[PDB]
Amino acid sequence: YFGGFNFSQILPDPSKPSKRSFIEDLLFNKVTLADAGFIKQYGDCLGDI
Amino acid sequence: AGCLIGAEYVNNSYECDIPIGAGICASYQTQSQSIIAYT
Numbered sequence: 796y797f798g799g800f801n802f803s804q805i806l807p808d809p810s811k812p813s814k815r816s817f818i819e820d821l822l823f824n825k826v827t828l829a830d831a832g833f834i835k836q837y838g839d840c841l842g843d844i
Numbered sequence: 845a846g847c848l849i850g851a852e853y854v855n856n857s858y859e860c861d862i863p864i865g866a867g868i869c870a871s872y873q874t875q876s877q878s879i880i881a882y883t
């Protein structure tokens with residue numbers, strides 16, 4: 796209770812493992828990524844599928 | 845970021861000294877002296 800101001804949407808939600816709010820999840824889902832090699836992906840292209 | 849050969853993982857947390865990768869740093873600490881890695 797912050798004087799009637801509802802901050803429950805920009806504040807983090809601890810149900811999900813990544814401690815991100817509702818609006819931050821919308822921002823991360825809206826901006827797609829190129830899926831670069833910051834995570835290792837040599838073993839994905841070792842198998843020819 | 846890869847794998848680290850020559851350093852040991854500690855379950856601690858410090859304002860880190862040498863950056864490595866995704867949230868992992870390294871430092872030359874006494875806990876005999878060695879290279880340790882941490883978050």
Ligand SMILES: *[C@@H]1O[C@H](CO)[C@@H](O)[C@H](O)[C@H]1NC(C)=O
Pocket residue numbers: 801802803804
């Ligand atoms: C704040 O807003 C959310 C959704 O907009 C709502 O579920 C929640 O009940 C609101 N908080 C209060 C105290 O009414």
